[PDB]
Homo-oligomer: A and B are copies of this chain.
Amino acid sequence: RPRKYVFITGGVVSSLGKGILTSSLGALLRARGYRVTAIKIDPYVNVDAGTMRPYEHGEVFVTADGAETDLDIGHYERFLDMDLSRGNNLTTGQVYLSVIQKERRGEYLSQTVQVIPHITDEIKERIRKVAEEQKAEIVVVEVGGTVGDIESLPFLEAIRQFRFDEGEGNTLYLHLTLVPYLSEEFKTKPTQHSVATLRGVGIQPDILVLRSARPVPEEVRRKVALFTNVRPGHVFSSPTVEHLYEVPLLLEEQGLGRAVERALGLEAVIPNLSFWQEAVRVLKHPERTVKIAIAGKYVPDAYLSLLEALRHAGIKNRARVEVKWVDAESAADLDEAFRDVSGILVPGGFRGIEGKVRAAQYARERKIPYLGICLGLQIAVIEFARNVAGLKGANSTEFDPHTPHPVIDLMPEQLEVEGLGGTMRLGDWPMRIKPGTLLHRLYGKEEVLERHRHRYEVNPLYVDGLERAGLVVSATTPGMRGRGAGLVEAIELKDHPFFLGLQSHPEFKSRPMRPSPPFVGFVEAALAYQE
């Protein structure tokens, strides 16, 4: 059977929730039993999100294969419930670099190389290759940027060519626009202009989705349909909502799923959205409520996946997890700052370390549930080494390269591989959990995979000592490709309600349908502490 392509573009302005739209349509299609995948096109020149601030100006997601991508990929994995790869984040830098390298190597056999057809060919081929390896019957492609700008032009053209290449019934085009609401009057002029510009570059949308404060009434939607050339029944609303998980349920309700099936010539399949329905029920009507503090170094979307993991966890506990932001780098005031808190979470980063060290001490001495992710584990290791192992001024050579006790340092030279020096650990790394530990109790397995993004590890040489002082290493890595063999992956304390730290980013793999165990435990313990 023919593979189907659903393209999604945006108009008028950006920030209309096009990523959640892509994710929501992907979920609707999966709830129908199809094998699906999503590709995020980012018109920027960056080859990948590798040279960008990992938290600062938005979170940089990390795929199982170690790719550093745009945060939308995380939205896709969570809504489609699947592992994506670096091929799912296509950028201008990738496409142009890849094409330029080919002609310098003379691979274009002496022809003059141009945006069309060469850059556009490269783009389509990349879309098909990824869809091929992930064996998808339906692939949802989101074009980043805004129709009408210069950057997305090569991509709008590339996807326009799919209609002819794939044959009738195999491609569908959706365009998301902004419909400001004043009067109680909906202003449709901007979407009329956006669609007109779109047709100008050669694309006729099949389906329109109108972003606005509230749903666009039928009368208005019909008018938009007639002046855009789109069937009235193919114009939908995208109202602002309280919970993102409402989006798919809402879109299916209006008939977007039905419209897409038909437009693609697929026989109607009744979707099973029971999960989304229950998740939204739990979200609107929590059974309980507990607040936890995030002593973060970056107090938007810097912790997108993190906050998502907590939400997936609260649902699993039928509880609304309220988040308190504690600067941490801001001194002695830990009693008030953690008063109405029942759990303390220290997330990753790469400045305010000393402030976080204090947050861990307080949580360890006051018996407050503590979860440490990436840097969060290192901090707990650092403060433990100081205040329990008596290692004066213990630290990571990241913050203090001259510390007398580098309990945390770069990849030991003994476990390093040729040509990989100075490269952090990325993507899935195997983790061997220790039976009888808290970790083991949370996961329920001995071998699991968790994603990483860091270049500092617990110094092997200080392990024996820290363990004697009471620190527990509930997990390590048998290594990978002969690298980092034996490195500590998790730590915890026995005489404590809940004190756990992991070197990986478990938020990344967290899914609404499968909460990350470390977070499920954190929220659970937090509830216990609350009484």
Contacts and interface: CB of A to CB of B under 8 A. Distances in A.
Copies of this chain held together in the complex: 3
Interface of A: 12-15, 43-47, 51-53, 56-57, 92-93, 96-97, 99-100, 103-104, 106, 108, 110-116, 118-119, 146, 148-151, 153-154, 157, 160-161, 163-164, 178, 180, 182-183, 185, 187, 189-190, 193, 196-197, 199-202, 204, 226-229, 300
20 contacts: A12-B189, A14-B187, A14-B189, A43-B115, A44-B112, A44-B114, A46-B113, A47-B100, A47-B103, A51-B106, A52-B110, A56-B110, A93-B103, A100-B100, A116-B150, A148-B193, A150-B154, A193-B193, A196-B200, A199-B204
A153 B113 CA distance: 16
Nearest to A228: B202
Given A13-B187, A115-B150, A197 B202 contact: no
Nearest to A160: B229
A64 to B, nearest CB: 23
B148 A113 contact: no
Contacts of A93: 100, 103, 113
A13 B100 CA distance: 27
A190 B53 contact: no
B148 A189 contact: yes
Contact of A12 (B116, B190, B226): B190
In order of increasing CB-CB distance, the 8 nearest A-B pairs are: A45-B113, A200-B200, A199-B199, A13-B187, A96-B96, A115-B151, A53-B110, A51-B106
Given A45-B103, A103-B46, A150-B153, A13 B53 contact: no
Contacts of A113: 44-46, 93
Nearest to A201: B196
A51 B202 contact: no
Nearest to A58: B112
A227 B150 CA distance: 13
Contact of A51 (B45, B108, B180): B108
B99 A115 contact: no
A14 B190 CA distance: 10
A279 B113 CA distance: 38
Contacts of A111: 52
A145 to B, nearest CB: 9
B202 A116 contact: no
Given A51-B110, A113-B44, A193-B148, A164 B226 contact: yes
Contacts of A114: 43-45, 151
A166 B153 CA distance: 29
B151 A116 contact: yes
A201 B200 CA distance: 8
Nearest to A187: B13
A100 B96 contact: yes
Given A46-B103, A114-B151, A146-B189, 15 more contacts: A15-B182, A15-B185, A45-B99, A45-B115, A45-B118, A47-B100, A51-B106, A115-B151, A149-B189, A150-B153, A150-B154, A178-B180, A183-B300, A193-B197, A199-B199
Contacts of A92: 115
Contacts of A116: 150-151
A104 B51 contact: yes
Contact of A104 (B47, B204, B227): B47
Nearest to A145: B114
A337 to B, nearest CB: 26
Contacts of A201: 196
A13 B180 contact: yes
Contacts of A154: 150
Contacts of A46: 103, 112-113
Nearest to A48: B104
A300 B183 CA distance: 9
Nearest to A14: B189
A229 to B, nearest CB: 6
A496 to B, nearest CB: 38
